[PDB]
Design a protein around this nucleic acid. Structure first.
Lengths: 59, 97, 72, 125, 72, 202, 145
RNA sequence: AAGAACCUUACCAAAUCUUGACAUCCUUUGACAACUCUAGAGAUAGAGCCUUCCCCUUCGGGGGACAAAGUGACAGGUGGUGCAUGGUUGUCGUCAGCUCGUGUCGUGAGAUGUUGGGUUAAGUCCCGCAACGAGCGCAACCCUUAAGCUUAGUUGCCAUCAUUAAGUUGGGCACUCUAAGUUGACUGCCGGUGACAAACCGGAGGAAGGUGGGGAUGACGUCAAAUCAUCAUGCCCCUUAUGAUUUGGGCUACACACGUGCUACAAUGGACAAUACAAAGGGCAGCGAAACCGCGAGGUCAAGCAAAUCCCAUAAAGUUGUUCUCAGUUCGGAUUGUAGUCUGCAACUCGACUACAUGAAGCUGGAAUCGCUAGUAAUCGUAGAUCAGCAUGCUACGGUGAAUACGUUC
């Protein structure tokens, strides 16, 4: 939904409504704001290899 | 002594830079200590694997950042020129001390 | 908490003479200073404006324990 | 005269100094009393000095960190067995028939990512 | 002991300051009268004094049963 | 579910598609890498690029473009790469440098034949003919095994199926097997047909 | 299933006493267990004057049965292999030394041990209860499992 | 949904707008406009003010990039459909199964290979045979742990020493630590049983012995299982609404039935004082050192750190002494009220927490039922993410730490 994406890419009434979106799709929740990426697109670019970062489940 | 904080993600580019910079300081100077490694503590991102349901199966992605510390004791003025001349690892992060 | 009351210009407009009938606020966050007891508010619970009369003793509370919105 | 060894169990690093003496467990060179909460079990770590009854009057010097206190006591038991290994090559079968150079790999197992508390699958209805 | 025989009876509880203690602060049941006068002042969270929702929130959806009954 | 092999083999034997470092800011590099990959996605409609790799060394980017048709990113003699590089300089406000190499054995990588099979299924061909001719023209070059799964509304079908014509070794669990994988969508009039090419080449 | 062992404690020199130490614990508390067993052992030395290896060995044979019933659809008198015998005797000793209702555990396990030498308590009554249930249901089988 | 004061928010009451909140074409204008003030709850209109050619052309241009109109093509939809779908994920199931080429038999559907003997974890092998071989799956080449070594000694370790509140520096890398790599664990050797073949058992070497331990990796397909709510699509429908913005409710309600989790129901304990120990991870508007006044939530000046230095950081349970002396209590910690602290235009619907006081069931849970074979269960803390502030939930690490497995009978 580009309604809230077209809303939140503008300066607002307060500075406390600047909640986190993915900057590729319109997903609001589980957005890793270190990456500014969501739950799903970080998995997709992790599996394609266009983030520099391994998968190791070897802890 | 000056130090560099040789900081990559993988070990495949940190060994070529740690072979390049150390032997550049050996062939242009004297008594440079080796690429002493850090513990390289990593960052684990744990997501659910699914889209809508299913927190019963999850997915790990870790991000390791390897760090070597190289000490040049008594640095020659040819060494501080010749380390900044050739720059070809293309993806390591160098800090100067 | 430090007591704010952001719409203080609506209080001091009708303060010296007899206060007008019912004045409305669309904010339950407006903390009650002890100088507009008797100012009859219409405060918004979401549905419409519910009236409240600030009588004698509600200086320490807000406009949100009054005019409920969960009914029953 | 100073046998510098090592030894571990369960994230507890140990570095012994076998010196000749009467014998006192000096952990962080302090005592045997305040550091270990098992002052009754002070002979669990004395186990290579009672299974090799050649001499049981030997002083240990450590200043070590790591893990807990039971795992640190079996870590300095591994350091006592490593110091008895590096002290004499004929102790080894007297080690190996009692074991005691067996580093147990029994660490705290990893938290499994679908289960709640690492083989604690969270209560099917 | 003396100091833990006074924690459930009214007035003093368990962590105050200490035939001498006969006097001091509000040691009698007048604090019960002040709590009943404060709940008379609110009777406005008297809409949730039949429930168990305070001034500072509860989320009563399935468990507020300590001002309620077992099954009721 | 069947995991993809390019997820499983980055940082094992095959390198990542971005080689830089970022720690402090870190969202101003990856999203500009996403918009520059979306800008090479406009010339993927003619150029057939498999993947680009971002080499951000310190200020300028020696971006390594890998197209199976190498003569149509560069134009006649080098004009199209320069006006493309000026358009990337406009659209990321940073410095870039196009590093092209000319990759033949075009039917051995998954993304070129995945876009080719999705191109043939956009043009209402029958899926079994292009699937069998893709796996036999990939074996007459010499390959070690080609799985090709097209799925969805198969040829304008009412019920979705999963037509996979696996041939030879596609050994996803032996981890020293560099398996190319690509899934390419095909926007047909009867919906969206996903191809899935899984080529093991030793 | 090779059923490996733990070392004996050198305070009371037996291998049964460290199995009692590992049986009386709760929530992984071994120091609480050593606090409540060795003081119960010293209460045994201060009340009935004898070393507690002898009276504990003679008191654990008044809890230990020789028959056991295992029903299947039923009761058989299977003889018990002695590690299972001694761990059920120690488990009955703790599980009736947890349910006496006294001041502390050091005066709860210790007089239950000295009641097991004088053939009373709840533990020797449990041995006559499993002998009563194995003798009243002796008649059904000798052969089932 | 790994973050519900506004936002999220789609839903609902009000204020409104129609090229619209936004993508794009064209014309006009143009280095954009931000910031204060009025109404209002703000969205929105209205004043001061030009930021007003930055790349460059003769004056006028072209146009990186903005704004208004015509509203014209277009928007937009978290609207309906997972039973049109891709992509993605659960369960059977980490169980050992599933198929194909060629040939043979069979009118044929089909079978053989894959079955029978022995075996293991295995369709893992070996024997004989209309089977011969191959492919996905099992077994690892993958990572971590489990023992040294080549190498390199800093912020880390102190042999041996000078020396302090401190390994804090002089010196060194003795040990330890750490990591790019090396050697190793491969039934490898011996004996017995073995068809002499697969293997099983015992012993030795080794740190680890029988896939060394754990994870990833999940076959062909099943449930028309979930998602048109990440995204796009195939159809349908609106586009002065089902599109948009803002304030106030909202997902954060109970007479309830149910699922998961915490707290306990106390003497193994409740409270007070000293004292021990680590891993794993993070930090720049963030981590707040010491010190300070605070009973206390916190607040003040504040070193240091773009990170083995500096911080989160006392990790907690344990041990030593004291009390309570078996109870609805010296347990609890729900509830109510007052004083409050902090984030943030703000704690009323609705955040975390401290003090004081009230102290409600709870004294061990029935029929049933769940999880677990070794560092397991149980218990106890620590850290990350989401987060302007919020956890008994998720994730990851660590301390203490047991027995049971006669068997597989049902």
């Amino acid at each position: 939904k580009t309604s809230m994406v077209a809303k939140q890419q503008k300066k607002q009434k307060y500075a406390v409504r600047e909640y986190t979106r993915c900057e590729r799709c319109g997903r609001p929740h589980s957005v890793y704001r270190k990456f500014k990426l969501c739950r799903i697109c970080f998995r997709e670019l992790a599996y394609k290899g266009q983030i520099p970062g391994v998968r190791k489940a070897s802890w | 002594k000056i130090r560099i904080r040789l900081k990559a993600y993988d070990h495949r580019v940190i060994d070529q830079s740690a072979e390049k910079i150390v032997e550049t300081a050996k062939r242009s100077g004297a008594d440079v200590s080796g690429p002493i490694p850090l513990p390289t503590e990593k960052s684990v991102y744990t997501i659910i694997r699914a889209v809508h349901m299913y927190k019963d199966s999850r997915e790990q992605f870790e991000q390791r950042t390897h760090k070597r510390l190289i000490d040049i004791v008594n640095p020659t003025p040819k060494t501080v020129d010749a380390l900044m001349g050739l720059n070809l690892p293309s993806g390591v992060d160098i800090e100067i001390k | 908490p430090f007591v704010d009351e952001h719409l203080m210009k609506k209080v001091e407009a009708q303060e010296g003479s007899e206060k007008k009938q019912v004045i409305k606020t669309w904010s339950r966050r407006s903390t009650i200073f002890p100088n507009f007891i008797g100012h009859t508010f219409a405060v918004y619970d979401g549905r419409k404006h519910v009236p409240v009369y600030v009588t004698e003793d509600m200086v320490g509370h807000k406009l949100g324990e009054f005019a409920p919105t969960r009914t029953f | 005269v100073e046998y510098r060894g090592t030894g571990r169990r369960k994230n507890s690093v140990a570095r012994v100094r076998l010196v000749p003496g009467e014998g006192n467990i000096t952990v962080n060179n302090r005592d045997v009393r305040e550091y270990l909460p098992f002052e009754s079990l002070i002979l669990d770590l004395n186990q290579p000095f009672d299974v090799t009854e050649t001499k049981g009057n030997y002083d240990v010097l450590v200043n070590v960190h790591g893990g807990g206190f039971t795992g640190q006591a079996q870590a300095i038991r591994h350091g006592i067995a490593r110091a008895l290994l590096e002290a004499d090559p004929e102790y080894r079968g007297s080690l190996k028939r009692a074991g005691l150079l067996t580093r147990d790999p029994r660490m705290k197992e990893r938290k499994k990512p679908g289960l709640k508390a690492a083989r604690r699958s969270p209560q099917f209805s | 002991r003396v100091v833990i025989s006074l924690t459930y009876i009214y007035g003093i509880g368990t962590s105050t300051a200490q035939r001498e203690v006969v006097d001091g602060y509000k040691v009698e049941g007048d604090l019960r009268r002040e709590t009943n006068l404060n709940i008379k002042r609110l009777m406005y969270r008297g809409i949730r004094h039949r429930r168990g929702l305070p001034v500072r929130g509860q989320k009563t959806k399935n468990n507020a049963r300590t001002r309620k009954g077992p099954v009721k | 579910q069947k995991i993809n092999p390019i997820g499983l083999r980055v940082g094992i034997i095959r390198d990542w598609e971005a080689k830089w470092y970022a720690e402090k800011d870190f969202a101003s590099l990856l999203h500009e890498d996403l918009k520059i990959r979306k800008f090479i996605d406009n010339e993927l409609k003619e150029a057939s690029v498999s993947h680009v790799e971002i080499e951000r060394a310190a200020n300028r980017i020696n971006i390594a473009i890998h197209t199976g048709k190498p003569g149509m990113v560069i134009g006649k003699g080098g004009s199209e790469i320069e006006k493309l590089r000026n358009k990337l300089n406009a659209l990321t406000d940073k410095k870039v440098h196009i590093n092209v190499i000319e990759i033949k054995k075009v039917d051995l990588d998954a993304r070129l034949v995945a876009e080719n099979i999705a191109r043939q299924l956009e043009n209402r061909a029958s899926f079994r003919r292009v699937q069998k001719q893709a796996i036999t023209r990939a074996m007459k070059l010499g390959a070690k095994g080609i799985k090709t799964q097209v799925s969805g509304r198969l040829g304008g079908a009412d019920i979705a199926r999963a037509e996979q014509y696996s041939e030879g070794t596609v050994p996803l669990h032996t981890l020293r097997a560099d398996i190319d994988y690509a899934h390419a969508e095909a926007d047909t009039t009867y919906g969206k047909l996903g191809v899935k090419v899984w080529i093991y080449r030793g | 299933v090779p059923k490996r062992d733990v070392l004996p404690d050198p305070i009371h020199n037996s291998k049964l006493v460290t199995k009692l130490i590992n049986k009386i614990m709760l929530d992984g508390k071994r120091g609480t267990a050593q606090r409540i067993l060795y003081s119960a052992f010293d209460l045994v030395e201060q009340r009935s004057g004898r070393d507690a290896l002898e009276v504990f060995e003679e008191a654990i044979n008044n809890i230990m049965p020789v028959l056991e019933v295992k029903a299947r659809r039923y009761q058989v008198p299977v003889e018990v292999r002695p590690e299972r015998r001694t761990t059920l005797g120690l488990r009955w000793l703790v599980n009736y030394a947890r349910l006496r209702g006294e001041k502390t555990m050091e005066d709860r396990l210790a007089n239950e041990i000295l009641d097991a030498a004088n053939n009373t308590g709840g533990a020797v009554k449990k041995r006559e209860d499993t002998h009563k249930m194995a003798e009243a249901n002796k008649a059904f089988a000798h052969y089932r499992w």
